[PDB]
């Protein structure tokens, strides 16, 4: 129903068990602590949700700390919509301390964009830690057991 | 209101015609050009 | 033996046809009732909100 | 104090509503782009200053002193309506709006229910807490009437309407909850509970299971009739529907009917029946031709879809290749910028840029091949249509028109024979009797028969006019087919024009973006050479 | 007060209506700019394709 048909999370082991982030302190089944790089997601195209308003692909890359989101191509379009948005103002981390940054946050459009992004990203985080736990359970269960006959 | 609205649209009429003529002329150009261009490949085709 | 095997294979094919048709018709009517239940839910929300 | 809802008040209401639901603070609110309007407790006494809202989807005017409704005809796209608890006494002015579904008329002076035949699609209606006198009133809106009243409403006018409360009406306080059961038997869990009361189901005959079986049958008949109507119209013969009504447009036939009404009606019925049957075969053949033409066209769009999808897949693969090119180029750019060897960086960057121009050239070539393929496909399909379907329709129309002509000529010959026989009979009879009540119709027949040449010319003019009208309707149908096919082809080609323009614009935009990014990389790499001196 | 109210309402609906009326000309000029651009590009494309073939 949701139409997100493709979902993946890049990995890179170039940094140790960073000791601050709970969301980044992961009870990885395999070894315990591991560290994060990026996410990619691909959605189904509802005929009734507009392509330029409905996201088909999205990339929340932590190394770039900016999101790489794809949008469908409109009828007659061959200009792919590869939007590279900044994630500086994504969870309210935006510094209001700067007097001078054009305060376009007042626009509810930015508010809805960020709400959608945060919901999607936290949902993926929790679902993927749950996937960790479920995969741990499944593989241990099919490993330890002996062989049964009917 | 009626007088000024009517005055505003007096020019409109002529503009229509001009556009139409231009539009019609445009078609001719494309047609004409297409003709010539097509013959070109026809020649090549026969040459081929 | 050969002719009875022929008849039994024909029976297997006929039963395949019968049950495939059963499944197809059942799917069609279930989808119909899913759509009707969708509409049921929209006007249930309608009545609830209007009554309140 | 009486007031009016003014555009200053319009902006005030807009601001209050936007505050209520945190709408964007836009003073430049387009007045032609309004969807929902709330006017909570303005004590509104009249409705005014709302023209231009044909796109309205939500509206509220509760808690006011409004008393009259009218002129809501121009608003025919409303969805959410709430006008209850006002000084309403009658319902009217909304006969044009079919799209509304939430109708609130609760707690008013409403006593007669009328004006909702057009909005059969309504599902929510609140008219409770009123002065309504009779329950059977509501019955008129769901295809059920009290037995014993002559009811010409043989077509139900509200089926999906499942939101209806009138609770609190005057008659609703007598014989508790019996009227609800009676109306429901003429009209969600409450419905099941009421249907389970023995008296409720016993006191009527037209139940809901049979009602819904009849509804399905009737809707299937309606769908088949609509498909037949579209079939006949696409046959283009619909304009001939007046051919059998021509005589009622033919006065001379009425004048000549006096001479011998009996066989005149007999021959007219024979003529109409034969014309109807053969014209029907005519539009049936035309319908076969038009259906195969429709299949031709639809396969046209299908083939365009497959070939286009092939074009976008090839273009997207090439574009992915170039995006990999860009990403490798940028990775090496950063690596060597840490290195700082500007010469090699800019050399590889011009290599990339020449490759980018190559991509421009090849993409334009892809568009060129698109042009050849689409043009060839369209010309081939147009020639196929002309050769087979257009020509078959041509021949069918020719045969049908001359067959109608055959019928007209035979009808004219029969009229000539009947006229001659009547003339002979009058000539024989006039020599025996010369005095019979100076009959008006007898005198008219005598005058018509004496001018036999006049009668012959009148019938000849009748036949020529009939043939001319039939021929003109035939050619009108033929021209309708011509214009229909021409507009199909014109729309397809023009839309191809805009599609080509749009794709070329996209390609140009992408090449410009590539060139600007390459120039940015090169210029920053070069400017990195201006601190070291 | 009522007289002035409807008079002002008619005046404002008149700004609306006449701003609508002085819009066919602007839309026509914009679409003619569109058509001129399209036709000039079409002619240039025809000549360039002629050259290439």
Neighbouring chains of E at 3+ CB pairs under 8 Å are B, D
Q: Identify the helix (H) or strand (E) that includes residue D379.
A: helix D342-384
Q: Report the run of H or E that residue D268 belongs to, with start and end.
A: helix D261-339
- Best of E30, E43, E51 to substitute, by most chain B Cβ atoms within 10 angstroms, is E43
Contacts of E5 in chain D (CB under 8 A): 4, 6
**Chain C residues within an 8 Å CB radius of D163:** 43, 46-47, 50
- Residue of D104, D163, D165 lying closest to C46 (CB–CB): D163
**A107: closest chain D residue by CA:** D24
The alpha-carbon gap from E13 to the nearest alpha carbon of chain D, in Å, equals 9
With CA atoms as reference, the chain D residue closest to E35 would be D498
- Minimal CA separation from E34 to chain B, in Å: 11
d(CA A118, CA E3): 56
Residue of D nearest to C39 (CA): D160
CA angle centred on D102, ends D101 and D105, rounded to 5°:
130
Q: Which residue of E has its CA nearest to B20?
A: E32
Q: Give the minimum alpha-carbon distance from D334 to chain E in angstroms, rounded to a whole number.
A: 40
* Nearest CB partner across the interface for B1, out of E18, E35, E47: E18
- Beta-bridge mates of residue D165: D126
All residues at 6 or more sequence positions from D401 whose CB lies less than 8 Å from its CB, including other chains: D470, D471, D474
Q: What is the total residue count of chain B?
A: 48
* Whole-angstrom distance, CA of residue A94 vs CA of residue D119: 52
Q: How many CB atoms lie within 10 A of CB C50?
A: 21
Neighbour count for residue A137 (Cβ, 10 Å): 11
C4 reaches D (C-beta below 8 A):
no
C-alpha–C-alpha distance, residues D187 and D138, integer Å: 9
Q: Which residue of D has its CA nearest to E53?
A: D368
Nearest to D132 by CA among D81, D168, D85: D168
Structure tokens at D399: 């045969």
Taking the Cβ of residue D107 and every Cβ of chain C, the question of whether any pair is shorter than 8 Å is answered with no
Q: Determination technique for this PDB entry? A: cryo-EM
How far apart, in whole angstroms, are the C-alpha atoms of residue D117 and residue D100? Answer: 12
Tell the residue number behind the tokens 């029907």, with chain if given: D280
C-alpha gyration radius of chain D: 38
Kindly determine whether residue D102 and residue C50, on different chains, have CB atoms separated by under 8 Å.
yes
CA angle (A71, A75, A77) in 5-degree steps: 65
Q: What are the Cα distances from residue A108, in Å, to A104, A115, A122, D106, E8?
A: 9, 10, 21, 37, 35
Judged by CB atoms within 8 Å, which residues 18-37 of E form the interface with D? none
Backbone φ/ψ region at D6: left (φ over 0), alpha (ψ -120 to 50), beta:
beta
B4 to chain E, closest Cα gap in Å: 8
Angle at CA of residue D285, ends D282 and D286, nearest 5°:
85
* Token pair belonging to D58: 């939500």
Four-residue CA torsion sign, A76, D319, A4, A23: negative
Chain A environment of D315 (Cβ under 8 Å) = 78
Place of tokens 């104090």: D1
Token representation of residue D59: 């509206």
State which residue of chain C sits closest to D163, comparing Cα positions.
C47
Taking CB atoms and an 8 Å limit, are D49 and E5 in contact across chains? no
CB of C50 less than 8 A from some CB of D = yes
Q: How far is D322 from chain A (nearest CA, A)?
A: 13
- Of A52, A41, A121, the C-alpha closest to A87 is A121
Distance from CA of D86 to the nearest CA of E (A): 23
The size of the D-E interface in CB pairs under 8 A is 14
Instruction: Copy the structure tokens of residue D159.
Output: 């089926």
Distance from CA of A133 to the nearest CA of D (A): 36
- What is the token pair recorded at A8? 């993946």
- Find all residues with CB under 8 Å of D60, minimum gap 6, and list them: D37, D38, D39, D40, D80, D82
Q: What is the CA radius of gyration of chain E?
A: 23
Q: Which two tokens stand for residue D49?
A: 């200053």
Interface of B with E (CB under 8 A): 1, 4-5, 8-9, 11-12, 15-16, 19, 22-23, 26, 29-30, 33-34, 36-37, 40-41, 44
> Residues of E numbered 2-31 whose beta carbons fall under 8 angstroms of chain B's beta carbons: which are they?
14, 17-18, 21-22, 24-25, 28-29
CA dist., res. E50 & res. E30, Å (int): 30
Report DSSP letters for D180-236, one per residue: HHHHHHT--HHHHHHHTSHHHHHT-S--HHHHHHHHHHHHHHHHHHHHHHHHHHHTT
d(CA D82, CA D60) in angstroms, rounded, equals 5
Q: Which secondary structure element, helix H or strand E, spans residue A122, and what is its range?
A: helix A108-144
Cβ distance D25 to A106 less than 8 Å, yes or no, reads yes
Closest CA to B31 of B39, B42, B19: B39
Residue D410 CB coordination number (10 Å): 13
Distances, alpha carbon D377 to alpha carbons A140, D302, D374, in Å: 61, 12, 5
Q: What is the largest CA-CA distance in chain A?
A: 74
Q: How far is CA E18 from the centre of its chain?
A: 14
Of D4, D51, D368, which is closest to E5 when you measure between CB atoms? D4
Contact check, Cβ <8 Å, B9/E21: yes
Do residues A129 and A36 touch, judged by C-beta distance below 8 A? no
E-interface mutation test, from D501, D503, D507, D508, most E Cβ less than 10 A away: D501
Smallest Cα–Cα separation from E35: which of B19, A62, A74, A5?
A: B19
CA nearest neighbour of D78 among D60, D56, D61, D47: D56
Are E and A close enough to touch, i.e. 3+ CB pairs under 8 angstroms?
Answer: no
Is E18–B40 a contact, with Cβ atoms under 8 angstroms apart?
Answer: no
User: In the complex, which subunits touch C with 3 or more CB pairs below 8 angstroms?
Assistant: D
In angstroms, the CA D204 to CA D147 distance is: 9
Which among E2, E5, E36 is the top mutation candidate for probing chain D, defined by the most D β-carbons within 10 Å of its own β-carbon? Answer: E5
- Distance, CA of D497 to CA of D508 (rounded, Å): 17
Q: In this structure, are residues A36 and A7 in contact, taking their beta carbons and an 8 Å threshold? A: no
Q: How far apart are CA D466 and CA D473, in angstroms?
A: 11
Q: Are D20 and D38 in contact (CB under 8 A)?
A: yes
């Amino acid at each position: 129903d949701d139409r997100v048909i493709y979902r993946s999370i890049r990995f890179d082991n170039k940094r140790a068990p960073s000791s601050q982030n709970n969301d980044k302190v992961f009870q990885d089944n395999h070894v315990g602590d591991v560290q994060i790089t990026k996410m990619t997601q691909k959605f189904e195209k509802n005929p009734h949700y507009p392509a330029n308003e409905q996201i088909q692909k999205m990339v929340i890359d932590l190394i770039k700390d900016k999101v790489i989101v794809y949008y469908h191509m409109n009828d007659g379009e061959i200009t792919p919509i590869v939007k590279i948005y900044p994630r500086d103002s994504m969870h309210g981390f935006a510094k209001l301390n700067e007097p001078g940054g054009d305060n376009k946050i007042d626009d509810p459009l930015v508010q809805l964009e960020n709400t959608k992004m945060v919901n999607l990203e936290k949902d993926c985080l929790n679902q993927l830690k749950q996937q960790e736990k479920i995969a741990r359970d499944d593989e241990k269960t099919i490993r330890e057991g002996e062989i049964r006959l009917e | 209101h009626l007088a000024k609205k009517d005055k505003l649209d007096k020019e409109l009429q002529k503009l229509e015609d001009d556009f139409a003529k231009l539009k019609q002329d445009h078609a001719n150009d494309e047609t004409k050009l297409k003709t010539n261009k097509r013959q070109q490949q026809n020649s090549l085709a026969d040459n081929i | 033996v050969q002719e009875e095997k022929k008849d039994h294979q024909s029976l297997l094919k006929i039963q395949q046809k019968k049950f495939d048709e059963l499944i197809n018709n059942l799917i069609i009517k279930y989808e119909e009732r899913l759509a009707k239940l969708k509409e049921d839910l929209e006007l249930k929300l309608k009545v609830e909100i209007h009554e309140l | 104090d009486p007031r009016v809802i003014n555009e200053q008040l319009i902006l005030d209401a807009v601001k209050q509503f936007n505050q209520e639901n945190n709408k964007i603070t836009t003073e430049n609110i387009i007045l032609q782009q309004l969807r929902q309007l709330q006017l909570s407790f303005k004590n509104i006494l009249k409705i005014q200053h709302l023209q231009g809202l044909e796109r309205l989807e939500k509206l509220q005017l509760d808690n006011n002193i409004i008393e009259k409704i009218e002129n809501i005809d121009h608003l025919v796209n409303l969805k959410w309506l709430d006008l209850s608890f006002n000084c309403i006494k009658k319902i009217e002015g909304l006969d044009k709006l079919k799209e509304l579904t939430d109708l609130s008329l609760f707690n008013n002076y409403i006593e007669k229910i009328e004006g909702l035949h057009n909005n059969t699609k309504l599902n929510v209606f609140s008219i409770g807490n009123n002065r309504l006198k009779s329950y059977e009133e509501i019955t008129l809106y769901f295809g059920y009437k009290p037995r014993g009243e002559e009811g010409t409403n043989d077509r139900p006018e509200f089926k999906r309407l499942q939101v209806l409360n009138v609770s609190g009406n005057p008659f609703t306080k007598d014989k508790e909850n019996e009227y609800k059961n009676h109306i429901i038997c003429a009209i969600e869990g409450d419905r099941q509970l009421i249907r389970q009361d023995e008296q409720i189901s016993n006191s009527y005959n037209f139940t809901t299971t049979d009602y819904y079986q009849q509804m399905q049958a009737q809707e299937q008949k309606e769908e088949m009739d609509r498909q037949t109507l579209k079939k006949k119209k696409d046959a283009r013969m619909d304009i001939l529907d007046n051919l059998k009504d021509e005589y009622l447009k033919i006065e001379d036939l009425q004048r000549v009917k006096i001479i011998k009404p009996n066989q005149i009606n007999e021959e007219i019925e024979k003529y109409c029946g034969k014309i109807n049957d053969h014209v029907v075969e005519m539009q049936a053949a035309v319908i076969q031709k038009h259906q195969l033409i429709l299949q031709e066209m639809s396969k046209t769009e299908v083939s365009y879809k497959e070939q286009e999808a092939l074009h976008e897949k090839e273009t997207l693969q090439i574009l992915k290749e170039f995006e990999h090119e860009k990403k490798v180029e940028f990775r090496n750019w950063e690596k060597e910028a840490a290195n700082g060897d500007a010469k090699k960086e800019e050399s590889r960057l011009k290599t990339l840029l020449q490759k980018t121009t190559s991509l421009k050239n090849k993409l334009m070539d892809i568009e060129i091949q698109l042009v050849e393929e689409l043009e060839a496909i369209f010309t081939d399909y147009d020639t196929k249509k002309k050769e087979t379907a257009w020509k078959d329709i041509e021949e069918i129309i020719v045969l049908g028109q001359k067959k109608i002509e055959e019928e007209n000529v035979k009808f004219y010959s029969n009229l000539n024979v009947i006229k001659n026989k009547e003339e002979a009979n009058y000539n024989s009879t006039q020599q025996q009797q010369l005095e019979e009540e100076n009959n008006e119709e007898d005198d008219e027949k005598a005058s018509l028969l004496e001018n036999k040449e006049q009668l012959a010319q009148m019938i000849g003019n009748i036949k020529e006019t009939l043939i001319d009208s039939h021929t003109k309707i035939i050619l009108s149908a033929q021209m309708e087919l011509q214009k229909d096919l021409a507009e199909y082809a014109k729309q397809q080609k023009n839309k191809m024009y805009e599609r080509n323009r749009k794709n070329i614009s996209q390609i140009i935009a992408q090449i410009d973006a590539y060139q600007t990014e390459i120039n940015e990389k090169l210029k920053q790499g070069d400017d990195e050479s201006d601190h070291e001196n | 007060k009522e007289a002035r109210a409807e008079e002002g309402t008619q005046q404002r609906m008149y700004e609306f209506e006449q701003k609508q009326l002085k819009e066919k000309i602007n839309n026509l000029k914009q679409k003619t700019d569109t058509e001129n651009m399209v036709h000039e590009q079409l002619r240039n494309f025809l000549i360039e394709k002629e050259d290439q073939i």
